[PDB]
Every structure is written in C-alpha cells, then in structure tokens.
Write a new protein. Structure first.
Length: 360
C-alpha cells in the first residue's frame, strides 16, 4: 500500500527527461518521415504513436518509444496462414487501379519481407545523414516487425511499417475485445469500426519464416483503451474518480523488469515481455469492470488482483491475446514450460512476502 505508493514515486518520469527525449525522437522521426514521403510506395505514410510512452505507462526513464509508419492500403483481401489466427497473406482485389505497391507483389501476394527490406534500406541510408545526431540501427533478434534505432547511445525507437485496412476486422477477432461489461457494447462497436493494422512479422517455418506473411496489430486500440479506461466517462477527470488502473499496470511492468534483472545471470526470463503483463492487465480490467473495483485507496488489493491473475496465466500456461482469443501468448511454441514455471515460482515468492523486490 504505502510501499507501492513509494515505488510509483520512484517510477515517475522526469519532465526534463521527457522533453529532451521526445525532442531527440521527433528529430529522427520527422527526418525519416520526410524522406519516406518522397518514395512512391511509402507516399501516404503517416505517423501513429503507440506503446507505453504514449499510453503514459512508461516507467523509470523515457528511453524507449514505439511508432508505426502506417500506409493506407485500400481494397485489401486477407488469407489466414495455417490456422495461426494472427498471421495472414495480403492480396488485392481485381486491380481496379494500378498500384503504388506493385513492386512488392510475389504474384498476387504482397510480400512483407520485400516491403520491410526496402523500408529498412531507406531508413539505413537516411540515419547516416542526420543533423549531427548520433543514430545507429540495431537489429536485435526475435523477428521484430520494427526497424530499431538507438539515438545518442541512450534512446531506442521502434519504427514499424504497418498496412492500414479500413475493412471489417478479421473473423479471428470476433470473440476478442471483451469490453462490453466494462467500457460498453456501444464502445466495442465503435472501436471495431476503426481500422486494423498489419505489421511485417512473419509466421515461423522451422529454422526460417513465411516471408510473405503479415501479423495483425491493434496497438492503436490498446492506446485508446488505456487513455479512456473507465466505466465512467469522467474516470480520472476529477478528484472523486481517481482509479488506480494505470498505476497497477506500471507496478506489474516494474515487477517484471526487476525480476528479469535479478535473473540476468542465466537470462531465464528473457522470453517474457511487458506485453505479457499488459495483456494480463487488460483481462483483469474485463474481470473487474467497475471503477469502484479500482479505487485509489485499494491500490494494494488491485495490484494483488493483477498479480494473482498473471500467476494463474503462468500456471495454466495460457494468456489469451486480448483481441485474438485463440492466440495463446504462453503456448509452448513461444515460451517453454521451464521458463513459465520459473517465473511462477519467483512471482509466487514475491507475493507471499509483500514483494521484497520492491524494498529500498
Ligand atoms: N507479442 C506481441 N503481440 C502483439 N503486439 C505486440 C507484441 N509485443 C509488442 N507489441 C506491440 O508493440 C508495442 C510496443 O511494444 P514494446 O515492447 O515497446 O512495449 P510497450 O507496450 O511500449 O512497453 P515498454 O516499452 O514500456 O516495455 C506494444 O504496445 C504492443 O502494442
Ligand atoms: N510501433 C509498433 C507497434 C506495434 C508493434 C508490434 C506489433 C505486433 Cl502485432 C507484434 Cl506481434 C509485435 N511484436 C513486437 C512488436 C510488435 C514491437 N516490439 C517492440 O516494441 C520491442 O520494444 C518488438 C516485439 C511494433 N511497433
Ligand atoms: Mg515501448
Ligand atoms: Mg518497443
Ligand atoms: Zn481512471
């Protein structure tokens, strides 16, 4: 309770850090957008800010930003890849007008690897010409859909090409976004009338990938739900309606980062990400729909509700994608049994002992 409040104070971002960091990102992102808008393929490219900074749940330091460079793609037709629910081939319908994206077609299929390789090539050419800002491209590992840049040896930015489709959401999402009892059926209907996005992350095929495939993304809806998160339309707009939803997500994020640090010696928790705690947090919001279940004075119990549900996901080896229910973030194809059992034991110990990982 009071220990958690002190943790949240420590996690607060400094306004001086926010300002200098955003300015460095803006300088790079703006320069990259200008160049890309000169290419015919990436002509109508547009900025879409996503991830924890723009959801206001980034913790500790503003040193990681996520942006999508969305491309409006009309007349788009999807073909699910091998029942994976999240990965798709992209096609166009009947060539009614000739395409800007025709150079990336492998037959009738729009190749994600071709589009991403050219996107990456342009950004690489551009970063070694920026206004005396030190910018370096990093390719981690894990098949990220992003081009990752390090600015001033300090600030990471993920730049993700994303196709924008204004069509109805794919059938695999029909039972997802279960917000009806929390944010209302009205809101769910309005949200599902919004575009969805496809990012160039490929389905796995042995040692390699299906290099034409794309993956569904609802990162923009995640931001909208986090920034408009109450049952009451005035949640967090006045002194009588201060909930602790965002504080709970922040604490979950910090719990995971701290444990990943304490297990750096064998990198046992390497496969776990903040997106796992984010997804579990959205499910707890569905389970606890009332703002009164997130009262600021109940921070300790609400965080406990969050921790217990995440443990249950670990122990049952099931964490459903909030938008695609049959996509299991915790399947053995993605995270091994040993890793999940390991994190369960640690979170179990931390909970039973009032989170010593949070002591100063
Ligand atoms: N496994 C995934 N499935 C679907 N979307 C993902 C996945 N991993 C990341 N994302 C999307 O990418 C965005 C940026 O991811 P990132 O790893 O930067 O985490 P984040 O939410 O920004 O939190 P933080 O950066 O503070 O760890 C996420 O908000 C999420 O929308
Ligand atoms: N700006 C954005 C937003 C959404 C996505 C993204 C989308 C989908 Cl669908 C999946 Cl499966 C994704 N996996 C990862 C990302 C991602 C992005 N990513 C990181 O941000 C690491 O910090 C790597 C891991 C990408 N960039
Ligand atoms: Mg991020
Ligand atoms: Mg990121
Ligand atoms: Zn609120």
């Amino acid at each position: 309770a009071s220990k958690l409040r002190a943790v949240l104070e420590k996690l607060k971002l400094s306004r001086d850090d926010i300002s200098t960091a955003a300015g460095m990102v803006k300088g790079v992102v703006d320069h990259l957008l200008l160049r890309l808008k000169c290419d015919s393929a990436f002509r109508g490219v547009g900025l879409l800010n996503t991830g924890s900074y723009y959801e206001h749940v980034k913790i500790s330091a503003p040193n990681e930003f996520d942006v999508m460079f969305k491309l409006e793609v009309p007349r788009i037709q999807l073909e699910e890849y091998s029942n994976t629910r999240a990965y798709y081939f992209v096609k166009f319908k009947r060539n009614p007008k000739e395409n800007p994206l025709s150079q990336f077609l492998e037959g009738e299929i729009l190749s994600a690897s071709k589009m991403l390789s050219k996107f990456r090539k342009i950004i690489k050419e551009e970063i070694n010409d920026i206004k005396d800002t030190d910018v370096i491209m990093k390719r981690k590992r894990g098949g990220s859909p992003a081009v990752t840049l390090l600015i001033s040896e300090k600030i990471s930015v993920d730049i993700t090409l994303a196709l924008e489709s204004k069509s109805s959401w794919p059938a695999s999402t029909q039972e997802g976004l279960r917000i009806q009892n929390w944010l209302s059926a009205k809101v769910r209907k309005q949200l599902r009338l919004k575009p969805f996005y496809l990012v160039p992350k490929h389905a796995k095929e042995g040692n390699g990938f299906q290099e034409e495939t794309w993956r569904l993304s609802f990162s923009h809806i995640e931001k909208e739900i986090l920034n408009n998160h109450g049952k009451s339309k005035t949640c967090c707009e006045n002194k009588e309606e201060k909930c602790c939803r965002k504080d709970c997500l922040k604490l979950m994020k910090y719990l995971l980062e701290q444990l990943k640090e304490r297990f750096k010696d064998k990198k046992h928790l390497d496969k776990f990400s903040s997106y796992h705690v984010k997804t579990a947090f959205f499910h707890v919001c569905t389970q606890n729909p009332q703002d009164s279940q997130w009262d600021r004075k109940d921070l300790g119990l609400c965080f406990d509700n969050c921790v217990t549900y995440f443990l249950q996901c670990l122990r049952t080896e099931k964490l459903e994608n909030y938008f695609i229910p049959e996509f299991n973030l915790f399947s053995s194809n993605l995270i091994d049994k040993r890793s999940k059992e390991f994190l369960t034991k640690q979170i179990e110990y931390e909970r039973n002992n009032e989170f010593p990982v949070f002591d100063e």
